[PDB]
């Protein structure tokens, strides 16, 4: 997160860290045994670390659970990043409490202007790479589809939405992928792509989860 702030230990109970000997992507717990992340975050031997703040130190509340399977969206396309969404089944159910809680799937899509909270352990610097030990948070509004598609001509599909600031200085960045974009207590987005980080006229592009609410439900229901 570039331009964000320190969330505060366990203040974002649904944030999970995708670890494989290092933090590579983010995710959000939607229930005790299922996590939502980005399809481009997929790799073998994914360990899901819940209840984290400082990813480098063990300070209580962590739950290390291994991915029992990662269900990438059948129609994911690595070039366009369309359908950039992946479900990760946990080997064992996580213990839910005040420090580890699931986030709600939206019932409808959010509107341009809606203030959302984006969080993650991704790069905190646009020009260079500085990673934080603790979870960073950022408040950013969903942009209007016209401003989104104008910034990324022909690259924005109906399953993508822009969130952020056109002036730059505040944006999600590498390491934040798979992370949550929560608006009014509903998981509205998954950190996906963007042209750099916190660059002017280059907002962050996110996976429009409302389009996948039914896919998610059915997939989970059959696994």
């Amino acid at each position: 997160i570039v331009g964000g702030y320190t969330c505060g230990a366990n203040t974002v109970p649904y944030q999970v860290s995708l670890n494989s000997g290092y933090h590579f992507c983010g995710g959000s717990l939607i229930n005790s045994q299922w996590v939502v992340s980005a399809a481009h975050c997929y790799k073998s031997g994914i360990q899901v670390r819940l209840g984290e703040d400082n990813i480098n130190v063990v300070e209580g509340n962590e739950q290390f659970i291994s991915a029992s399977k990662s269900i990438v969206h059948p129609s994911y396309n690595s070039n366009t990043l369309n359908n950039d969404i992946m479900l990760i089944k946990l080997k064992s159910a996580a213990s839910l409490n005040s420090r580890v809680a699931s986030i709600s799937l939206p019932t409808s899509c959010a509107s341009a202007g809606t203030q959302c909270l984006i969080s993650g352990w991704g790069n905190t610097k646009s020009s260079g790479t500085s990673y934080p030990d603790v979870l960073k948070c950022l408040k950013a509004p969903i942009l209007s589809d016209s401003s989104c598609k104008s910034a990324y001509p022909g690259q924005i599909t109906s399953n993508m939405f822009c969130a952020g600031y056109l002036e730059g200085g505040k944006d999600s960045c590498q390491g934040d992928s798979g992370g949550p974009v929560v608006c009014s207590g509903k998981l509205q987005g998954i950190v996906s792509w963007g042209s750099g980080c916190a660059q002017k006229n280059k907002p962050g592009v996110y996976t429009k989860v409302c389009n996948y609410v039914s896919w998610i439900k059915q997939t989970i229901a059959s696994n």
Partner: peptide
Amino acid sequence: EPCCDSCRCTKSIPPQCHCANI
């Protein structure tokens, strides 16, 4: 030479810059 024009990059560790130059 460099990463095209506006290298569309994923925000993963490490990133995937499939670029935007079509």
